[PDB]
Amino acid sequence: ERPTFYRQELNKTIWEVPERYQNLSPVGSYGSVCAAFDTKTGLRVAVKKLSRPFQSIIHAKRTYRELRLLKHMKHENVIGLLDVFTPARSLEEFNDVYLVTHLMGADLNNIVKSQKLTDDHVQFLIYQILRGLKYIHSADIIHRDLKPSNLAVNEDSELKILDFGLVATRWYRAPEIMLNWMHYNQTVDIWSVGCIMAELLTGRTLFPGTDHIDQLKLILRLVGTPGAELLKKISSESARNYIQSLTQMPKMNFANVFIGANPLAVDLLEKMLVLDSDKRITAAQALAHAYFAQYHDPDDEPVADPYDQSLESRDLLIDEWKSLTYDEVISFVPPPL
Numbered sequence: 001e002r003p004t005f006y007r008q009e010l011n012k013t014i015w016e017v018p019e020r021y022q023n024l025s026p027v028g029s030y031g032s033v034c035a036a037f038d039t040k041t042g043l044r045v046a047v048k049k050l051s052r053p054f055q056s057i058i059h060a061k062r063t064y065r066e067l068r069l070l071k072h073m074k075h076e077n078v079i080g081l082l083d084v085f086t087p088a089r090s091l092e093e094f095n096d097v098y099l100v101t102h103l104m105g106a107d108l109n110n111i112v113k114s115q116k117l118t119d120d121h122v123q124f125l126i127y128q129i130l131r132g133l134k135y136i137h138s139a140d141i142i143h144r145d146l147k148p149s150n151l152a153v154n155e156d157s158e159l160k161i162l163d164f165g166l167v168a169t170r171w172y173r174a175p176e177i178m179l180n181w182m183h184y185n186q187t188v189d190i191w192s193v194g195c196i197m198a199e200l201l202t203g204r205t206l207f208p209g210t211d212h213i214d215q216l217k218l219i220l221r222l223v224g225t226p227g228a229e230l231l232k233k234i235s236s237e238s239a240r241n242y243i244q245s246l247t248q249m250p251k252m253n254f255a256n257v258f259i260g261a262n263p264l265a266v267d268l269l270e271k272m273l274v275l276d277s278d279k280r281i282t283a284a285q286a287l288a289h290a291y292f293a294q295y296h297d298p299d300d301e302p303v304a305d306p307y308d309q310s311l312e313s314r315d316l317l318i319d320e321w322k323s324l325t326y327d328e329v330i331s332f333v334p335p336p337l
């Protein structure tokens with residue numbers, strides 16, 4: 001049986017939602033987000049109304065990708081769906097899509113505040129990010145924009161990685177993404193984790209570049225200029241030649257950079273923040289690192305089904321994408337709760 005819907009404007013947008021969801025309150029604005037109370041479960045929830053989901057091919061395509069991705073993500077440390085709804089009663093009237101998930105209420109800046117965290121707390125937060133990333137990476141997905149705003153956290157420090165979130169974003173990006181390499185390893189996400197971890201431990205941004213080149217300079221100053229093995233892996237002649245033209249600079253000792261940190265934390269940052277992405281520690285490897293001894297449970301670090309990215313990278317008409325998104329709404333089964 002179809003739920004009864006009600007409407008109300010919030011910030012120039014009409015939202016029509018099932019009666020289930022009450023006390024809609026804007027928090028941010030791909031789409032706009034209201035906190036809300038789900039009366040059926042007793043849970044506070046975030047409700048996201050997609051923006052103009054089927055007005056162009058590319059909005060339709062994006063809509064389908066987000067819905068399908070979120071339906072497939074079922075893991076404690078990755079954002080997933082509690083509900084998906086449309087007021088529409090048929091394909092012909094299908095114009096709006098709303099996604100529901102657990103309200104976390106905060107992201108990593110909010111909990112953190114630029115103050116340094118205890119080692120135990122840093123351990124717990126990074127452990128959860130890695131646990132989520134193992135899962136994402138097992139599905140052959142690369143996040144590529146891991147940063148503090150893309151990590152939702154509740155007040156008990158429980159964390160979920162977000163597709164898109166609600167402090168420069170460049171600050172956490174892997175060097176190869178700053179230079180537009182088009183082949184990427186999953187360990188681009190591991191670089192981002194090293195950056196976040198450093199910050200949590202020291203209370204300061206690791207690489208706070210004022211712009212792109214300043215950022216690459218700050219990176220090279222910590223990790224050193226590329227060695228002989230790395231230089232051999234550069235396809236672009238102009239890049240190769242530029243890099244060789246640079247004054248060699250040694251890698252810094254991270255003990256001198258992270259004074260007084262847990263030596264296990266220092267050891268793990270050295271394995272995350274290596275310039276050559278082939279040499280960076282993987283999510284699964286990092287989870288087994290001794291830094292996480294109080295949290296690591298090799299029987300509770302689940303892995304995903306491979307994810308068919310080819311279906312969302314098609315070139316289809318709006319009405320095809322719209323109909324496919326419609327079937328995903330209908331086929332949705334809410335999770336055990």
Ligand SMILES: CCOC(=O)c1c(C)c(C(=O)N2CCN(Cc3ccccc3)CC2)c(C)n1CC
Nearest residue numbers: 027046047048099100101103104105106107152
């Ligand atoms: C003070 C800064 O406040 C915050 O950072 C903050 C965060 C991170 C959250 C939160 O829990 N999110 C972020 C947005 N997705 C939307 C969504 C994604 C997918 C499906 C459905 C909805 C849900 C998880 C909230 C409510 N806030 C308060 C605005």
Ligand SMILES: CCCCCCCCO[C@@H]1O[C@H](CO)[C@@H](O)[C@H](O)[C@H]1O
Nearest residue numbers: 073078079141142143144161162163
């Ligand atoms: C919920 C966890 C899913 C994380 C991955 C989804 C984030 C989508 O953001 C990214 O879009 C980029 C283009 O902007 C692509 O290059 C990336 O591979 C893709 O992950």
Ligand SMILES: CCCCCCCCO[C@@H]1O[C@H](CO)[C@@H](O)[C@H](O)[C@H]1O
Nearest residue numbers: 175176181183184185233275276277
């Ligand atoms: C300023 C020059 C230093 C930046 C070099 C970044 C090195 C990243 O490392 C490189 O990642 C590539 C992109 O995914 C991979 O193809 C290579 O195997 C790996 O060596």
Ligand SMILES: CCCCCCCCO[C@@H]1O[C@H](CO)[C@@H](O)[C@H](O)[C@H]1O
Nearest residue numbers: 179213214217236238239240242243
């Ligand atoms: C491998 C990618 C090659 C990128 C070449 C970047 C060259 C930028 O060049 C540098 O940029 C800055 C000025 O904006 C200054 O810090 C330096 O003096 C300047 O030489």
